[model samples]
Every structure is written in structure tokens, then in C-alpha cells.
Target chain A: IIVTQTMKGLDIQKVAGTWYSLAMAASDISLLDAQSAPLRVYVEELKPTPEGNLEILLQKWENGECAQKKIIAEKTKIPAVFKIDALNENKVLVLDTDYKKYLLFCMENSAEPEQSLACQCLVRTPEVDKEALEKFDKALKALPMHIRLAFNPTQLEGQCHV
Target chain B: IIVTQTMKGLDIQKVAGTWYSLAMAASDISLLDAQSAPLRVYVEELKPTPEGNLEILLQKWENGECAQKKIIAEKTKIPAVFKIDALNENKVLVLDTDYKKYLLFCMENSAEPEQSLACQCLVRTPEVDKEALEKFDKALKALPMHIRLAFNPTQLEGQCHV
Candidate 1:
């Protein structure tokens, strides 16, 4: 099973709120294409539960519109690391974060060697930060996934009403 | 021409970020499907230029990847409103926002009658807020578009990786 090392001293409150997806390296992007076009700038909102658990809300544009999913994450022994039941023991680790500027998270699936790893970069805003991005790339490269494809989202301007 | 009533005191900076596309009413959705597939979380990143202009980056999941387009938005006389040159005089209005909650934005396109209007709601996270959603719907109904289709994206899970 693939396990990940989580960041220490991570505060749940600071990590809560919406984070913009800046770049990502996924095992498969087939489904993402159905959700966002020309770019994939999804948002992840983390909420703290009274029981000290975490509620994750993932929002994405899909099939000409928007959709969301709610999942519960249980805290792990490792700080800022969570085990999401819905993902079948998919361990989500907070590799790095400042809460205000950017977040680097990783999903290590226990399933197999093929779908074993994935990484995402979430930011408070968009404007590619090379230093921050490079750090993420280096970390991802260290992972077991032999080949990785890092993607950058596009900028847009237009109408969206009828 | 079908025009929009601008929202008062709209702050572009406050409205900029990766907004999770919540809902949409548009003339066509064929293009969107090709861009965002199973994961439909759309992202809109707004940046300020050195000259105080606004730079809009629209990113979506496209053809097995993600891409973005940069656009310049010049502030209009109306507060929180701007004119996007790329869309041929389309007026982008910030109908409402708290930055971390949700965003109600309307696009008044100057194109032909069939494609002249559209609306989009971007949220900080994704949980489908009823109050915020209704507000956008109400504003959309007030628009002059004779017909509209409020679309709901498809829900998806599973995998497509190698």
C-alpha cells in the first residue's frame, strides 16, 4: 500500500476555506475533461467538524454546468493527514501549506501501483509562482510514479449568461 | 442591445480567484463538455496589471490537459464592472460577492441575438448554497434573454488512469 508523509503542526482552521487549483498531476484526467474545458480551475473547501473531523467539498464545472461532492475525512496520527472513506483508504496528506498563499496536497491510493499516486496545487489566487510550483514538482518527482504530467490552467474572458 | 444593470460597489480584486462554477445558463454547452468532462470544477483567476488594469485567466480541463487564456478587462464607469475586449464589448458585471463565499457575475454579450447573453455563478467552494444560487437565478431572469437553460453538471466518480 502507498503511504504518504504528512506535514507537521498543521492547523485545521487555517486550512479551511476555498483553495483555487493552480496546477495538478493526476493519474488520469479523463473525467476532469468532462468537468472543465480549456482549463481546470476547481476549488476545494475544507470545513472542520465538531468532532475534530474534516468535511471536504469539491466543486467542479461539469457538462456545461457546475457540480459538487461532499466527503468526510478522518484525522490520522500524522498531522494534516486524513483518510477519506469514500476514496477507499485514499490517504490525503498536506505536504506543505501556509494557509494564506498556497497548499500542496497529495493523494496516495492503496489500490495499486498504477493508481497509487497523484498531486495537486491549490492557491489563494492565480499567477503561477515559479518558486512555489518548482517546490511541488520536486516533491512529486520524488514519489514512486515514474512519469508525471503537470498541467497549468488557462485564463479566460467572455460572457456566461442567457 | 440587451444590457445589464450593474451591481453597486463591486471590487474586482475582491472578486478575483479560482471560482468553482456553481451553475450556468447559456445558449450552448457542446463546447463546455469537450473542455470539462468528469471533473467540472472550473476556475477563474483574476489578476491586476501594473497599470491598474485587470487580467482575467480562465482555465478549464481541455483535450487531455489544461490551458488558460489571458484577457484584459478595462474598468467601466460602473463600479465593479468592466468591458472585455476579447468578447467584442461584452460587459462583465460583479452582481455580488464576499470573495470567500460566492460570486454572481453576468455577461452581457454584444454578439448576435442568439448568443448575446449568459450568466455564471462562481463560489469559493462547492456545496450548492441555496440562498446565493437563488439570488443569481433572480438576477438572470431579469435579463432580456428570451430563452434560457439552467444546466446542472453530471455527477461522476471512478477512474480512467493507466
Candidate 2:
């Protein structure tokens, strides 16, 4: 039930690089300024709806206190399809957690909680780190049984062995 | 009018990266391939009313010329809003051209029309080019004109230009 625009008055996108979070609803959430704060967040489900926006579910940790929960809400209230207009050019497009909800184009990397774009900025989120990938795999396994069943077996077959 | 998906004939998101030409009502149009053959053709208007879907317009182009100009039944459709999602990095959002009615997003840069993880694509258009802008401006000036007629006849106080 904790909501946030800036977590603890910090810009979440700047500190974390690019990440997913848990249970952020109308409250501020951000990574600590400390270097020791874990900054990798992962999303499991993200897609576009006929309404032209996107929806997503992701997991992440805050200040090293990790949790396998999903953040569900629409951050950008829009009715258009999502797209990547450019890359390596400091631009990113973000969709809200709710389906066909909202989208944002800016330079704020979602990894850091302290980073945000007052103007329309687009920051690039580099590839996920190995540790981040590992946590994401673990989180996939942690999903409810019913949720796991929803995934296509073909996508899962070759991904989990390693 | 020529209505092209921003991404050509690739993924939906591929077209989402670029601009789009939404057809006006009472217009029939078809997309042609490199050699001038029909690819994807449709004549319809989307009315997200009581039940959202599409409204069929007359089939075939006006006077059998696809490039022929026709009445817009309404105002021009512009791509005003572009959106994107973060999950999978390949998901495509959408573009809304309802004008000043939406905003661009950051996630858009992450989703491009690439060989991999290409959720959507966009088509290129010269609508916003310099010539187009001039034409658009000229059209705006033709609208109803209002004047603030406060004539002050003071040759000493006002600088006169020949």
C-alpha cells in the first residue's frame, strides 16, 4: 500500500539505472544514495493492449531488502502504442503497470530512485548485470503456480537450465 | 491520402517507433508493396464509442486513384502521443495522433525496429518537414481574424517606419 512518485524524496530512476520495483503505488520510492544499495529490478510480464498503451509486472528490492512482489499501476496515462523512438541517444519509453494504461518518454533510468526527468528526457538502460539476471530467474520461480502455468512452455524450455 | 504504418510491414511496435498516417473517415486506402501490389488494405474509421472497433467506409480509392485528395469528414489526424513499455524490451506500445492530447515517453527509445527484441517499428514521413510546416502555417492564418483597433495618433511618441 506504499505509494510514491519519489521514494523517500529520492529520484528512483537516477540511482537504480534501469529496474523494476515492488508495491509502489502513489508513494515515493528510490534507491539509497549509498553505493551499497542493490539497483537491479526485473519485470516478468509486459505487453501492449489494443487501447495503444502497455501494462507490466516486475520485481525488485529496495536498499537490499529484496522481495518477490509485482508492482501494478499505470505510470503514464495515455492511449497510444509504446515504442522505442531511438537508442544510445539517452531516451527511454516506459509503460504503466496497468494494461493499456500510460507511457512516458524520458532520460531517467529506472535503476536509481533518486533520478527523474523534470523535462522530457530519455536515458538508456544498459544490459542487465549477471547478478540481476540471477535474481530475475529466482523471482520467476517464485511466482504463484497458477501464474507460472500461464507462460508458454516453448519460451521456458531452454531458458532455465543454466 | 497515403496512410502508412510507421514500421512498414514489420511488427506493430516497429511501426510505433516512427510516425503514422491515420486515415480520415470517408476515405478508402490501400498499402502497396515495392512493385505496386496491394499489401494491407482497409477503409474504416475507429469509433471508440459504446463499443469500440471500426467503421467501414466506402471500398476502393476515390476515382481509382489512391493519391487523390478527398474530404476529411473531419480534421486531420496527427500522431500526438507516443508510448512504450519496459518488459521484454521487445514489447510495442502505440502512437496516438489526436493532437496535444497526449505526451511522448522515455521507454520509446528502448524499443526500436531492430532484428532482435523488435516489439514495434515506425515509418518515416515528411509531414513535419520545413515545407509542410510552412504550408500548415499558411493554412492557420486563413482562419477567422480579430483586430485590436486602438489607433493612437501621436507622431512624436511613436516611432514611424516607412
Candidate 3:
């Protein structure tokens, strides 16, 4: 019984980069694995498709090797929201972002509310501003119970694995 | 069914510094509250008593004020091991540390084998070397179930409220 909201005016290109996951709350995804300190997600490239959608090359080091996933995010009327084919048709929303320091994201299947997921990520830096944390905290609190309980943040020290 | 072990030859003075909590697994004592991200413990001064015991003035900010606790650590014949009078006769053990980056500690009542408690803390730095994390990981695996479940690491960005 959670009402999830999406952000507006997102610039996909600007948000693309190597992001270090600071915290996460996932429904089915392993929150423990997702919040592991050494875990890093490389948004290697966001290519445009003929259908006017974006093909995102999401890469990460899995067990010391480069593991990659192809994500197809289609544009929506909402500038910051997209329908992700890779996420089982779940709508990916940009909850909040500064495009420089941190980014907050959420994904939910309209047909299945139990699939709601939320995550917070940072840039190469291992820290965020107070204002950004407050915003992240607020957004996280708004999520449903199942998602909230799975929340786990990274605590390792240093610039994320680039 | 937890087995508590104490460390020997601890030079408490050398272990004093601003330590950022990387991960914690505690019971009774709120490791989350005690090691909150905005939280930093200043092991300001260690005073010696007539009994030849060390009294530590541990200071941190609570509700925007300087909160302090006077901890009296009595050295045992075993060197670094101590009987913390402030912690209800809990045995303090230095599990692992370089004194420069990270420190892992365990406190338990030898009289009650069931109530073993352990915690992990880091220096003010956000990132530690691979060796430290690996050593820390090994220690946590050796802890009992209750202590392991309570482990929560800080992921915030900023200096602690000293």
C-alpha cells in the first residue's frame, strides 16, 4: 500500500557515469549484495536507438571480472521517468539528483506493487552534502515497508572502484 | 553459545583517535546510535588513577552539546585486556587494529558466556586498505549469531559531530 512518486526534468546523459552505491532497498534484489561496499556500477554508455529509446550499457566487476547488462530505457512523457525493459517493464523514476554529487532512483511495476525498489548512489566521491543526505533520507522514508526494511548503505572508505 | 576471547598487550593511548565506524555488531549498546555517521568520539584525555588504572574522557556531541563519559578501564595482568568498570565489568578485547586506520573491539561478561558482544570501528578516513577489511571480515565471521545480525555500517558523508 505504498504510493511511489517519480522526479521530473531528468537529463539521462548528465546522470550517466560511474556511480558508487551508497545505499539500497530492494524487494526481490539482494539488498546485502547491492549495498556491498566494493560494489560499483559503471554506466559505460547510453546509446540512442532508432525507436527513440536509450540503450544503456551497465557494467560492474562481478567476482573480479567485468560483468555487463544491456538495459533498454524508453522515454516517457515525464522527462525524468522511463520504462525499463531490462527491469521487467518496471518504470524507473529519478527520485532526486544533483547530477554531480548524488542520485536517487526508484523502480516499480505498475501491475505489481510489491516489486517496488529504491536506491541511493553517489559519484566518484565517497561523500555527499548534508542537504543531499536529508533529501535522500526523506525520499527513502516515503517508500513502502517491504522496500524500507531491505535498505542497506555502503560503509567502505575511499573513492568508489572506477 | 558464544565464546568470548580477550586480547593481550593493548596500549590504550596509541589506539586513541577520531575513529569513523565502518561496521558494527552490538547488543544492548546501540552501536547504530553510538556510532552514528554524524557521531564521532574524541578520546580526548586518558587520566591515570591512584589504583594505577586508566580513566578515559570520551567526548562526543549529543543534541548539539558536548556529551562526555568518564570510562575507567582497569588493566589486567594480561596487558591490553581490561575490565571496563563503566561497562558493567564487561571484558574489553582489541580484536585487530593498526591504530592508524581501523580498530575492532569485543566486550563481554566472562561470567555470562551467552552475552558476548563485539563491534568494528574505523579511523576518520572513509576508506581502509584491503588488508584491514579482509581482517575485519574474518573476525566478524567468528562472532556469534546475535552479534553478527546487529552489524550496521555508516554510509553518510561528513565529519562527525565532535
Candidate 4:
């Protein structure tokens, strides 16, 4: 039986199914949410590393129906695959693409799509997670009006198992 | 440039002076703003794993002093040192004074005399960082009720060096 471990990180004890995008950001959370209009995120399967970690093979449906395979865990020496920043129902995956680059994916409700378009992605400190959202809100609060960020693409090496 | 690849999941980042305890689920959004009975979370550091992963160290505080310490990681090669199943952080570290597990110091946030209570130790879904906090809120929301976990005495060994 696969149970959730309280002490372990990357505990995808229940990571599976279709997740829809909602929000994202580049510098602030609000900016990401306004831009990147979310599509959908789906977790097809989860593979555990020899060290008892999880490697998730996730799927995304944007303008084009494509599949992306992510090695959530390999040797399991340091980082856990899913280093979530924040969320509500959908599991927000924070991918540190590079030093200052980041990719955040927002998963929608597994059972419904009422808030389907609510999921999204973002750059570093821009993900849809609660922390990012709060930080974004704080930034907006400090500013006079709302600000929109310039969204750029950070390459995802192996989109699918070609 | 201090960006050096030290193994996988071993990059400790900046520390968050304060981490708020909120009511959140794994897949949902919206954080619990009700700070009536808030828990304190302190993020010490985080590390990255080779296969794109991270390990997090967390310190829990309650009443006035530190209570417990927890380490959460994804895809950690150190299974015996970082078992996802064996590690449980819901238990109070001070409760087990049998082996002098009380590492939490006296309280500095409180004022009542003889109010010497140790901090509360806890473990959330993600390991550390604002992103980690975001995941904790998300994971909390995933479940129906609130979660309060503590780290095991065994976790205080080796890699958990101060």
C-alpha cells in the first residue's frame, strides 16, 4: 500500500490524473496568472527511484496535445522531484529550470472542470502556488496599478518519450 | 557565483525568518488566512538533487521556544538516512525525553514565568523555501483536517548536522 510519508519529500503518494492550468508568473504571481492562460496538466504515471523516490511522467494539453516526461527522481541523493511552492486542490510542481528560470504548473480539480482554466505556470517566484500568489499580491499592493510580465519560454528538453 | 553542483538535492538556499502555518490541501488553492490559532514554521535551508530534486530542513516553533526539527527530501539516495516511510514528524520531540531528544530551546516569544515550553516540531509536504511552504499549504488542503507531525529521533543523526 502506498501511503503518504510525513517526513519524506517528493511524496507523490497520490499523484495521478488530469490537472488543469490556472495561474503563473515571471517575477510576481499576479503577472503570471494574468498572462500564460492555463491549459491542462495530467499526471499519467509515477515511477519511483531505486532510493524509494518518485519520478512523475506528466502530460500537458495546450494549443497542441503533447506529452512531457519528467524524471522526478533518479538516484535520489538530494532534491525531491516535487518541490511544491503552494496551491489549493491542484498539485503545483515547481521546476527550477535554471538559476533564475522556473516553471510552475497548476493542476485543476481531479473530478471537475468548473475552475479548469484556473491552473497555470510561471517563472521563478512567479508560480501559481500560494507563496508566489501572496508575494505577487504584495508586490501589486506596493505598486500603483497592476503590472503584466513578459512571458518567455524555457525549453523542456524531452517533451515526450520519442 | 556560488552556484556549484554539490551532488543532487544538496543546495541550501536563503532562510525565511518566518513561515506561517495555514490550512491548505495538496491540489487546491486559497490559503487559510484565519490566524486565530496559527503555527510557526521556520525554513533553515534547502538543497538540490542531481536528478532535479531537493531536500529541506524545517524547524517548528510553538508557545515560545523551538520544539522539533524535520528533514524532507525528494528522490534522496540516502534511503536508510532518509526513508520516506519510516520518518514521522507528527510526534512531539520533547515528548520523548527518554533519550534526551529535547533539542528545542526555551521560548523567546512568550513572557509568562515558568512558561518554559519547547517549540513544536513538524513536517510538511515540501521540504523548505517559500516553494516548500506553498506545497505544505497545498498538502494540508488536500486532506480534510489539519496535520501536526514531528521528526523522529533517528533523523537527528549524520546528514542532519547543524
Candidate 5:
């Protein structure tokens, strides 16, 4: 199922770097809506490292200001999925991507909710990519079993650099 | 509590005009995130009518084009609240507003999701109103099961008015 949904041979290196999160979804709505959802993050960029690991740059709105955070994830058996030890997520997958315009992400960390799943839609620009959006809607609808929830894109203006 | 949480009296007359939706929250996250959630609407304005009722202008993106819709809500026991017959919401309240800047809304929908509820934060201008944002956060927290969700303020730049 994972292979069919994600590319058989993924581009871990190409998918990394300058990107913005356009929308987010989760198996449990709280994982997307609660103020304290562990996987709740506004991704800024994903960095590929020499060690075959990933350096993730993320941001969040705090006290009406943009706060920056960084984390790392080690490579997994599949080139697309990565292993990490976070309060919520122990594994994340760069499920699908096209070198130029968009990326699709899936993560498993519904432990707090007993069993949960999440998805993220990312883009290279703020404007609509007709092709990209069509795929996003399809990919989202494709994940049928889990209860679904969505989040708006992060405001990209004014931010603190790390 | 409604009397205290909502305005003692409201400008049902003044709160009618152009507006945009910024953020949203709901009792069940699906109500805001689901592709089929009942309360989903990109509100354009809340119009006060001669009969002391309101005509609500709403919009939704359909087939990659801006689609417009309109509905009416009759005056409820309070000027701030109005009764409307719809698939999801039967009552909606302009919980709080400064009249000039923003409006806080609360709605009691289906007794079906078992007392399901929802909220919307509206603004007149796109610029930040530090005060307006503050009140919105507080009023939202005051609700018992509301979950935080993101929604861009509906961009009405080239909306086709018909």
C-alpha cells in the first residue's frame, strides 16, 4: 500500500529544501486543531545532510510572534520514510513528491489518540499550481479510513531566523 | 453565560457590511475540516435588513472559480442572534464585535453531532487589529469543545458579484 501511494524510488535529496506548507490534515482533528497537538508545526524548509539524515527547519506562532525551531530525522529502510523520536511522531514519510513543484507527507503518531495519522501538502510558491492542487485533493481523498481534519497555511510574513 | 459572553446588546444594524473570515474553530474538527462538513462557508458579509433580519453573503470555491451564495436569518430573541433554517445551522450569534474592526461569531448547529458548535472570526480590514485578535482568542477559548483551525480571510479581490 505504501509503495503504491509513495514513489518506489524516492528523491530524498531533491524533496528537501526551500518549501512552504500549504495545508495540513490528520486522523484525529485534535492532532490538527488542538493548541497542544504534538505534530502541529509550520514547516519552513527541510535540509539534506551529508550523514544521510534530515535537518528540518520549522516555525510556529507564539505570543503573536514567529518562533523558530529545528529538529532532525534519521533515514529509514525506505528512502522516503524517516525515523525520529518526538513526543508524538516516531516516523514520518515524504510519501510523494515531484522535483519541482510539490511534496506530499504522511506521518504516524496517533499514540495519544491511541492510533492516529497525519498528512501535509507543501508547495514551492504561494500562488496556486493547478496541477499541484488537483493532486493534493486526490491524495487527501485517497486516504479513506482515517478520520480527517485540515489546517490552513502558515502566514509567511515576518519570522525569526535561526 | 450567553448574556455575559455575548454583548449585553449588539449593533445588529452596524455589523452589516463587507467582511472576511480569518480563522475558525469547531466542536468537532470535522465540522471545519471535512470536505462535507455542514458549516463550511466563506462568508462575505452579514447584511441587516429592513425587517430587522440579516442576509448573509457567502462564497465557496468551486471548479476553480469563485462561487457565491446567499442566505437569510430571522431575528432571534436577541438582535445579536438570528434564526436560520439550514442543513447545519439553525441559529447563529454575532457573539461580540467592535462594529468598526471585527466580529466574533458563535453558532448552535445540529443537536445531531450532539450539541455541535462552531465559531468564526471576521475582520473589516486585512491589516492586524491587535485588539480584535485578542478578543477573538479569548472568546474562542471560552467555548467548551472548540478546536483551533486555520482559514484564510476570504480574498474577495476579483470576486464576481452577481
Candidate 6:
């Protein structure tokens, strides 16, 4: 069994910019396929705060326009872990990010039952990088079947400003 | 050279509550020994925020009475690392803590010049914990002598309401 590791040496400056959601996997199918699935996040920007926390700017189509969302994730002792509150309280783990090629992240929702896990991959363009997709598969394969069964490629065809 | 490690497995609740400042060390003598030295902080309380960040309630002598000061430290990727903004923006590293006995904390002020580093040890009472003081010494010794020479046992006499 391949054990996935968080990027323990992540520097926020390297991963800050426009990113497109390429794929995602969730433990709860409802939270993955629902009309307002929280896993369907479109990242617009990542900013570093004075306190070293990360500011995430996201977008979603509402009424015909891409509305903005701002969330703050506090930095933690583990260089790859962060505490973020959105629709639920999440523990964000930066699984992997080459900064130039691909970014992979995972979220643990301690507040949600059965929906505790979600993994997502982000890229600079909507088109998936061949190598990036393989890395996502490798990381996603390490999880139990319950989460892998819920994996889905994010639909980015006509979603936002990107 | 001695090296210090942050408590990578700290549980915020375990370290929460009323703690008395036992000792302190700093790089800047002004920030430490001055009349309004920021190092003369008296911790009143520690609270956990909904976002999992830490709320540190501190007190300082104004004219004749204790005035309250509150600082919020955001959790970071590292379990023992926290970002706090008081007089200066600092990265708080939890060096060691027994939860029931003593807590050793170090702050790196990325925003300041000579006042870039400070370490403090806290206990349950004004009375010193012999072992706790030794642990503080070991951790403080890991730094350069500049900060160690500035080390002083915190004066908790007639400071605030216990």
C-alpha cells in the first residue's frame, strides 16, 4: 500500500495564483454530486497574510456570474497542514504541489459525518497535464475504496473567468 | 550547537488555561527590560477559537491597574507553530509542554529587527517548577548567547489577579 504524505516543506508563495479544479474525490457522494457540492471549488488566488495564514479566493457560478469567495486558513505546526472554515471546518493538507506543474490538496471535515474526506487537484489550465493526472491517481489510490468510488473529474467547461 | 524542536503533536486544549509566566528571554533588551517592555506580559487566559486558532488573553500594567490585551494566533501547517500579531507579527513555536506542569514557547518576530526572537516559560503558579526551569534553560540555550544573556526569570509578584 502506498502511503501518501503531505508536502511538509510547502512555501505559500510558490502556490499562489490562478488554479483550475481538475478533479476531486469525496467520501460522501451527496457532498460530491449535490447541486452545491463543497468539493466543487474553483480557486482564483492564494494570498499570504501578515500572520502567515493563507487567504484563498474562490469562485462559483451564481445566477449567471462567477461570484467571489474568500476563506482564511490558519497555518499549523506541520508545514503542510492548515485549518480552514468554509461550509464546514476543514483541516487542509497540502499533499503535493510542484508550483509550476500541479497542486494536490486534501481536506478533512471533522464537523461532518461520513463526509470527512475530500481530495482535490488544481492546475494552471483547465486541460489536465498527463503527468499531473497520474500523480492525482497515485495519491487517490492510497485511500480506502469508499472515497475512491466517489472520485469525479471536475467540470470546468464553461464555469468561470478562467 | 544545541537545537530546539517544536512540539509537533500538541493539542491546543491540553495547553489551554491560566498560566503564570515563569521566565523570559529576548534579543532586544528594550523590548524586554524597558518600562513598557512587551516581554513583561502576564497571561490571563488561553481560549480555542472555532477555527482552531488560539486566543491568548494577556494583561499589562497601565498606570496602576492591569489592563487587558488579547492576541489571536492562527494555527499553521506545523502542529506546534502559530502566527501571532501583538506589538509585532510573530511566529510562535511551542517548544515543549507537559500540559499539567509547564509550557515553553518561543516567538520569532519576522517583522522586527533586533527584537526578532523571544522565549517564555509558563507554569501553574508563581512558584517556579525546578524541572520546568531546567527545560526552559535547555531550550533557551539552543539560541545564540545574545538572547540567553537577556534571559531573566519573570517577576510575577503583585502583578495581576490570579
Best by lDDT: 6
- Would you list the rank order by TM-score, best first? 5, 6, 1, 3, 4, 2
Query: What are the per-model DockQ values?
Result: 0.07, 0.01, 0.03, 0.01, 0.05, 0.01
Regions of candidate 5 where Cα sits further than 4 Å from its true position: A1-162, B61-65, B110-115, B152-162
Predicted candidate 3 versus true structure: per-residue lDDT over B3-88, tens digit per residue: 23334444566665455555445432232223331223444444556565666665556676667777777877765566885444
Top DockQ model: 1
Residues B1-162, candidate 5, lDDT per residue (tens digit)? 366534666757888789876656676554655433556566788888888888988876556566778888898776677887764678887778888888888777646433468777788875445576567767864564324444322332335211
Off by over 4 Å in 1: A1-4, A27-41, A61-64, A109-114, A145-162, B1-162
Q: Give the per-residue lDDT of model 6 (tens digit) for A1-162.
A: 123688867888778777776666665433443324555456667787767788888776656566788889999888888999666677888889999878988777666665467777787776756687669768865663122211123445445423
By summed lDDT, the worst window of 10 consecutive residues in model 6 chain A runs over A144-153
Please tell me what DockQ candidate 5 reaches. 0.05
Superior by lDDT: candidate 5 or candidate 6: 6
Which candidate should be chosen as best, given TM-score against the real structure? Answer: 5
| lDDT by residue (tens digit), candidate 4, A96-162 | 2221322233233335423331322333332234554343334333222211222212222223211
User: Per candidate, chain B TM-score?
Assistant: 0.67, 0.21, 0.59, 0.26, 0.81, 0.82
- By TM-score, how accurate is candidate 1? 0.42
Q: Which 10 residues in a row give candidate 3 chain A its minimum summed lDDT?
A: A145-154
State the C-alpha lDDT per candidate.
0.56, 0.23, 0.51, 0.29, 0.65, 0.66
lDDT of 4 by residue, B42-103 (tens): 44434445553334455544455554564444343432122222233221111111111111
Structural similarity to truth (TM-score) of each candidate: 0.42, 0.18, 0.41, 0.21, 0.49, 0.44
User: For model 6, how does the per-residue alpha-carbon lDDT over B12-117 read when each residue is reduced to its tens digit?
Assistant: 8877788877666665434444335566566756787767799888777667667888989999887777888776757877888888888888777876634567
Clash totals for all models, in order? 41, 74, 5, 60, 1, 13
TM-score winner between candidates 3 and 6: 6
Interface RMSD for each of the candidates: 16.7, 30.3, 10.5, 15.5, 9.3, 26.5
